[PDB]
DNA sequence: GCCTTGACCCTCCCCTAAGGGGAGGGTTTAGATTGTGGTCTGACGCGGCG
DNA sequence: CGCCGCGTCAGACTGCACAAAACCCTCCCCTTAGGGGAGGGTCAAGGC
RNA sequence: GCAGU
């Protein structure tokens, strides 16, 4: 909208092309991460964690 | 659902003759818990006639019922919603008392939903030769 | 589980189902009879319009609660517009007169 | 494979195992059920069955 | 009272009813009143006892009846009858999201029907 | 705003006046790019733009020019919300009987024509003829004929008389009939009839005919020549996140109708034999009748799960229809739920409300009190403060619940004391603390029962919770005048 | 209704096909009675001598492709047109015309150029019927009289209003009222008679040609009906093999019926092959094309349908030979397509779930009431937008009205559109780069932490 | 000793036109193929046959 | 009148886990060049 | 479907 367009014009913080869709702990849940499994489709290059 | 108390009085003179519920030999509901809260439809008078015990259009609260059991009156003609002259609703006199508050009912009370809930709430508590006079 | 606002349903604009979808409690039919047995006409009306379905009305309600003004401007619930459009998709002309 | 697959995965009698404690499993395996394909429907079963 | 809510005309009188048709009892009562006010003798009727289902489905408001059960029959009868529903009870005002005509919404409806009448 | 809801039959002119264009093709969307296809069941040109203030070719993209019909694609530039309001239509190549006015007993087409429903279902399933005009011939106006009897009548009488089959014939019979004349004739033969059964049949037919002449309806509107198309946002085709789509059964039924209709137009152009076009007219009739009410005539259509398709009539009726599931009761914002425990320290007007439930139920109240008291400069700052749960939002939360009642409800709400208001006392648990004396009113024991909490927002709602529903006003029962807030 | 038609023998199909062929070549002779069609045949014959189009879709052969028959025997028809063009000197010309017909007997014609010819003939038909209906309801909208008295004088005149001299002789007021019509038929009554001799033949006898055409064409279409209605069992026997592949049973048999009508009007019996072997090809084509087109909610093209079918067949054989579902990186090497094409094909082939699908066999719930509306705006974001409007309005009220309106005018603030510098240059009576500097002035002014402390909280963290 | 208004030149960005290629719709095939596939509910009201 | 066939109905809230092919032809999308426009960089004049 | 009230 024009107001946040002006807001971008004043401060200069250009919005990013990506949206945060990360996995977060559900609210109220508190615990320890005890296992992480990464399943990668064949052909996709594995990250350092995989 | 659409039965609301919409008037203060329809001026009718009809009403049911409330009597105690006597199934055979014993009473199951006295006159007191049957007329408590109604308004009378006619002048209740003592068994000795010509002196009106309770006046015509009176709400029978607990003091008036105590007066009805001091004397021995056993049939009181009260006003009911089946005999209300009000069209599209019910007058506040033909209903009687609002049982939750204890006074005559206000204009605007949704008495049909209250009646339907009050009947169908106990529904889960329901299921699925010669005569010998007992006393004097 | 509790919600103030959140995700709403797609066809009808009512809140979603359960605490996994951030919920909203079904104020069903017997509870509407409970609010009709009291004279709670405004509580009932705000349960119908500006908490479930009045799409222009629930945003106004939020901005009024935030701006310190506990007042509603209820409109027609969107489920009733869905109903008028689904009756008209049969060969039946249902209307609103004035 | 589709017949066997739909029976084992999506039948009414092939149920997600109740795995709370050992007793839950050992009594979910000894379960008998009048419902299911070829059985009753819980809404149309009278007081006598 | 809500069960014995209809009547059948046995004598049409000086009125716009037919013998053997089931009319709302309040309608025929007020029609007889406004006829007797002008000297013409009104209709005579016999009250009917309907069940709570057959009386719920026989209301003069098709929104309540279509909302209750047998939506298809009620909607076809109301369509071919060219019916009109004035939102007078509680369910038709809950369906459309209005104040109910009972309780704290009774003053609002008295204002609304005394200012949309004159 | 409005004072009444009038229901009537929809003229084909009325059906064409609602619609914003004809759905000529069964295309829902394009498979490569999920833009909706032209002249289809989801058509941005017919049903409105799929995005806010943006035509489907992207040539016009802002509300600088709104209300503009683009020329590269015919999409108006307006809100996408109009896809919930804009209907379309289908021009049926053959007149099709409405299933509601044919099959819901007593049959209105049958009751109106004085014709048994077996005869009408045989005429409009192309199993018999019917003589829509007798002329100077012994053939009467409701006389059904077999195929060979019609051939014999054509031998003996030629092209003088008129006889047809299918819903075209029923429509010609409903159109040719005179309503006031037949009504007064039935009144005459009701005044001279003493058979009570015939008097009952005659008076119900007379009330039907006079209900038609008093309303604006015409009888032949019971035979659909135009069919409405629901707005596509009410039968949505939405992509699930897993790449797969999810559609309503209405798209399958509409797509079936349009396929059979376009094939009927094809056959009528190809001059196909009468066996094929009769079978196609029967299929179009049964597809429209499966769209309106599935399973009402014979076998229900089941698609791709071997489960019957949900028709238009099934959307609005039953325990899962709109009327009972979305209009008389509905899911509600500002509502929470938790287990109930005793809290015998409470007063009759108090409940115990968890701090983590009351911080969510009263979120805009806390946002507004953080904005007002200067503790937050914005609603985004106040949202972050409530999210981090600073020590000041708990003081704000103690401020905003002070005299603010909440309604507590234990379903099944058997009577009106199954919803009562209480002032919340912030407790640290996760379970509601319900006063002991009110338990008998709720039929609530603390063996796992849960209760929903609702927040009354407006000043009227708060004052009804305080004046009408508060548990101190509820100490007598409304069924009998006896106490219900009673020791136990 | 279908079993009440008896099947055909091998010789019955021959008889029906010969009835069809006799109907169509006699109706083609009936349009050959119209010699403008002869002129068109001969001018496209000279264009064949220039090879405007190919001969196979000009001619299919000749009955008692080789092109040298057509050239010289169309020259023979040209000599026949020569001997009929001038040999009228009108009682001796009436033999050469049916000689034209039965020397045209040996001709075969294609569907499409004959479709051009019959659309010209239907223009002729529409002209004839609209002129005769002009004659019909130009007088009866003026008069009230049974018009058989006026048709009895019309048939045969065809040149002028000499048949109107005895119209008034009845002296019953109809021809009195026809007085006022006796003029305005003028440019009608001659103009048809113009083209009458441009096509050479009289309006009444070309009406006879039109009705003989209608008789012959209904004779052809009657026998096209018997061949379709007899082979309707073949459509069912074929369509029962496609039953659960996306369409209903009746939809399949109706599309196969369309294919069978196509086979019937594309069948010729002179090849000596049985009709069922031809109709089977056409019915298979129609039914599979219908399944490819209208069996899916999100319709995919017929080439992608063929691709998905080949993929399913190949994966079926691979599963049968190696006992497991093949990976797309071996399914792509048993086929010869790239692996990402196999991946997108496998992503395409899925059908949409119904939103009334119950979740975990739970009937009171469905798939439809877990799907949220993502296009909505959160009311916190609506409150954020209205608060940002208020904050921006105040922090631009803290400026000079000129530059504050420059900013409200350059962005879309309080206005339906935003304006570029030239627009406002025409508006503010100021050159472009000066008001550009004014905008930069106000932006540098608002970047200060004096006023921009509330606005910065509208930026994310 | 320091601020506007142009002034000229420079730089990049978005709309437009065209060309290649993938895509998608279309037409045609000629040995004979001739009619497809759960039942587990009881009570109540009604309406047409007989 | 008896009877058979048919239509309508059967509590409310919560979680949990969840779902033939081959060849022709035109048409639309991706890519790229271009051109116009729309800001951006660095100064020349009085004015402040 | 499986549980809770
Ligand atoms: Mg309990
Ligand atoms: Zn009264
Ligand atoms: Zn556009």
UniProtKB/Swiss-Prot annotation, chain A:
Superkingdom per UniProt: Bacteria
Residues annotated as signal peptide: none
Function as written in the Swiss-Prot or TrEMBL entry: DNA-dependent RNA polymerase catalyzes the transcription of DNA into RNA using the four ribonucleoside triphosphates as substrates.
Entry's family note: Belongs to the RNA polymerase beta chain family.
Subunit and partners: The RNAP catalytic core consists of 2 alpha, 1 beta, 1 beta' and 1 omega subunit. When a sigma factor is associated with the core the holoenzyme is formed, which can initiate transcription.
Name of the protein this chain belongs to: DNA-directed RNA polymerase subunit beta
Taxon lineage: Bacteria, Pseudomonadati, Pseudomonadota, Gammaproteobacteria, Enterobacterales
Gene behind the chain: rpoB
From Swiss-Prot, chain C:
Reported function: DNA-dependent RNA polymerase catalyzes the transcription of DNA into RNA using the four ribonucleoside triphosphates as substrates.
Biological classification of the source: Bacteria, Pseudomonadati, Pseudomonadota, Gammaproteobacteria, Enterobacterales
Positions spanned in the full protein: 1244 to 1341 of 1342
Subunit relationships: The RNAP catalytic core consists of 2 alpha, 1 beta, 1 beta' and 1 omega subunit. When a sigma factor is associated with the core the holoenzyme is formed, which can initiate transcription.
Source organism (scientific name): Escherichia coli O45:K1 (strain S88 / ExPEC)
Similarity remark: Belongs to the RNA polymerase beta chain family.
The protein, known as: DNA-directed RNA polymerase subunit beta
Source domain of life: Bacteria
Gene label: rpoB
UniProtKB/Swiss-Prot annotation, chain F:
Domain of life: Bacteria
Binding residues annotated for Zn(2+) 1, in chain numbering: 55, 57, 70, 73
Protein residues bound to Mg(2+): 445, 447, 449
Family: Belongs to the RNA polymerase beta' chain family.
Function: DNA-dependent RNA polymerase catalyzes the transcription of DNA into RNA using the four ribonucleoside triphosphates as substrates.
Summary of subunit composition and partner proteins: The RNAP catalytic core consists of 2 alpha, 1 beta, 1 beta' and 1 omega subunit. When a sigma factor is associated with the core the holoenzyme is formed, which can initiate transcription.
Protein name: DNA-directed RNA polymerase subunit beta'
Lineage of the species this protein comes from: Bacteria, Pseudomonadati, Pseudomonadota, Gammaproteobacteria, Enterobacterales
Gene this chain is encoded by: rpoC
Curated annotation (Swiss-Prot), chain G:
Gene Ontology terms: cellular component: cytosol; cytosolic DNA-directed RNA polymerase complex; sigma factor antagonist complex
Claim: GTP-binding is one of the keywords in the record: no
Chain positions covered by the region annotation Sigma-70 factor domain-4: 395-448
Compartment list: Cytoplasm
Biological role stated in the UniProt entry: Sigma factors are initiation factors that promote the attachment of RNA polymerase to specific initiation sites and are then released. This sigma factor is the primary sigma factor during exponential growth. Preferentially transcribes genes associated with fast growth, such as ribosomal operons, other protein-synthesis related genes, rRNA- and tRNA-encoding genes and prfB.
Family: Belongs to the sigma-70 factor family. RpoD/SigA subfamily.
Designated name of the protein: RNA polymerase sigma factor RpoD
The organism of origin for this protein: Escherichia coli (strain K12)
Gene of this entry: rpoD
